[PDB]
Amino acid sequence: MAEVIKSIMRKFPLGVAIVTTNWKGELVGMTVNTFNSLSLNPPLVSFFADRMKGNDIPYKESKYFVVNFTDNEELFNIFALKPVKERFREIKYKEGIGGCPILYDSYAYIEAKLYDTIDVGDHSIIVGEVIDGYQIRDNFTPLVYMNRKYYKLSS
Amino acid sequence: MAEVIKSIMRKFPLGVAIVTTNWKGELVGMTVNTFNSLSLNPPLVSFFADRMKGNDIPYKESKYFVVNFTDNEELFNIFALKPVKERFREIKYKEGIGGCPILYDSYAYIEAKLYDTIDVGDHSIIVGEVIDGYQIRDNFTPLVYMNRKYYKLSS
Ligand SMILES: NC(=O)c1ccc[n+]([C@@H]2O[C@H](COP(=O)([O-])OP(=O)(O)OC[C@H]3O[C@@H](n4cnc5c(N)ncnc54)[C@H](O)[C@@H]3O)[C@@H](O)[C@H]2O)c1
Ligand SMILES: NC(=O)c1ccc[n+]([C@@H]2O[C@H](COP(=O)([O-])OP(=O)(O)OC[C@H]3O[C@@H](n4cnc5c(N)ncnc54)[C@H](O)[C@@H]3O)[C@@H](O)[C@H]2O)c1
Numbered sequence: 001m002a003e004v005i006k007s008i009m010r011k012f013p014l015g016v017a018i019v020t021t022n023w024k025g026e027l028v029g030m031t032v033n034t035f036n037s038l039s040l041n042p043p044l045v046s047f048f049a050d051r052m053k054g055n056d057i058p059y060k061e062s063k064y065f066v067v068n069f070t071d072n073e074e075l076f077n078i079f080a081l082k083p084v085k086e087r088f089r090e091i092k093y094k095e096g097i098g099g100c101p102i103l104y105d106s107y108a109y110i111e112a113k114l115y116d117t118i119d120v121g122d123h124s125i126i127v128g129e130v131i132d133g134y135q136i137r138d139n140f141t142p143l144v145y146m147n148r149k150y151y152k153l154s155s
Numbered sequence: 156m157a158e159v160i161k162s163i164m165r166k167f168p169l170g171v172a173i174v175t176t177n178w179k180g181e182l183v184g185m186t187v188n189t190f191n192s193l194s195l196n197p198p199l200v201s202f203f204a205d206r207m208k209g210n211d212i213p214y215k216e217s218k219y220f221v222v223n224f225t226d227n228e229e230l231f232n233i234f235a236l237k238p239v240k241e242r243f244r245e246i247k248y249k250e251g252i253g254g255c256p257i258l259y260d261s262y263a264y265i266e267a268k269l270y271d272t273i274d275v276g277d278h279s280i281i282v283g284e285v286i287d288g289y290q291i292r293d294n295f296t297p298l299v300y301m302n303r304k305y306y307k308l309s310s
């Protein structure tokens with residue numbers, strides 16, 4: 001059934017984001033296709049973190065996280081494929097709340113306070129309360145991920 | 156902050172699906188942009204159901220649900236905009252597991268057993284264990300929802 005999930009999801013298009021945190025001083029982040037809005041009152045956003053890779057642990061052990069929205073495919077590939085220790089060497093960034101890294105190439109970002117974590121199956125649902133949101137750049141081309149590719153929207 | 160969430164999400168592209176169930180004999184479903192894969196082992200998928208509209212209740216009170224994947228924008232609009240009592244009058248469907256409606260225009264669907272529900276903020280995370288998946292049609296144009304529109308992917 002893991003294979004039927006992957007086969008169906010390969011053709012299910014999803015927006016991508018790069019979630020980051022400052023994990024006891026270590027700058028970390030990852031490309032996710034599970035980011036979404038969860039609640040309006042209270043204002044909550046979420047993503048799913050793979051427990052099998054320990055992707056949950058930095059967020060569980062940090063008070064805040066940042067959601068970076070970017071149109072730079074290179075950044076998504078860095079934050080999916082490159083070794084953790086290498087990712088923040090290659091990109092421009094600044095620190096936000098809790099020291100969480102904000103990527104300079106982001107056209108928007110959210111700063112969130114960790115609100116809850118919920119283990120379900122082999123992932124943890126990471127839930128953040130939106131503390132602030134910023135729209136930096138008005139002109140951008142949002143990307144959607146499907147079948148290992150990053151597409152623009154038609155028209 | 157509910158407004159910053161909406162403003163950012165308006166420009167965050169997301170695949171859409173129509174989740175259905177047979178709620179004590181009542182055929183119901185809704186367009187969602189919160190469907191995703193949650194876990195591989197066990198094989199779990201999820202969506203977020205708005206408690207403010209009672210969208211959580213049918214799933215909480217039914218043993219199964221179906222995830223319909225379709226490329227028919229008309230269907231997404233029916234299952235977002237039209238009165239509940241009208242939706243299954245206008246479309247071709249059959250019943251699957253638990254009597255859950257499978258839409259004829261779906262190019263793929265998942266049958267799921269309700270695994271857990273988790274209230275977080277003003278939504279409930281509805282979690283289903285994948286019992287079966289089906290790819291009916293190999294030729295289709297997946298849609299992504301952004302800024303109230305249903306886009307095709309470029310190229
Ligand atoms: N944890 C996640 O939700 C998730 C999502 C996408 C990619 N990834 C990781 O990146 C790798 C490369 O991605 P790809 O697009 O080539 O994947 P793929 O070809 O292995 O799978 C296609 C799709 O299936 C779903 N999926 C795959 N692995 C999953 C997992 N462990 N848990 C929940 N859903 C999963 C994702 O939506 C993915 O894009 C994946 O094999 C996976 O290890 C993880
Ligand atoms: N519950 C949901 O996750 C959700 C998602 C999309 C749309 N909707 C409902 O459909 C209506 C029409 O959609 P639209 O695209 O014109 O919306 P919109 O212009 O009001 O908001 C834009 C986006 O913000 C997010 N959002 C809006 N309402 C939300 C809610 N109650 N909870 C979590 N996230 C929410 C969604 O991703 C939505 O597409 C929305 O106002 C909402 O009531 C609900």
Ligand SMILES: Cc1cc2nc3c(=O)[nH]c(=O)nc-3n(C[C@H](O)[C@H](O)[C@H](O)COP(=O)(O)O)c2cc1C
Nearest residue numbers: 030031032033034048049050053055079080084145
């Ligand atoms: C487009 C894309 C989407 C991804 N989405 C998620 C996700 O939502 N959750 C997750 O835990 N991992 C996801 N991954 C994998 C993480 O990015 C990856 O495990 C993380 O960067 C840590 O990398 P590492 O284990 O190789 O060091 C995704 C990968 C890609 C290619």
Ligand SMILES: Cc1cc2nc3c(=O)[nH]c(=O)nc-3n(C[C@H](O)[C@H](O)[C@H](O)COP(=O)(O)O)c2cc1C
Nearest residue numbers: 185186187188189203204205208210234235239300
């Ligand atoms: C594209 C789109 C995405 C939606 N996603 C969700 C969702 O994920 N969860 C939810 O509870 N409602 C979502 N909604 C709203 C439901 O479709 C709607 O509340 C449901 O069909 C019941 O309709 P009603 O309250 O008008 O009767 C979405 C609406 C649209 C337009």
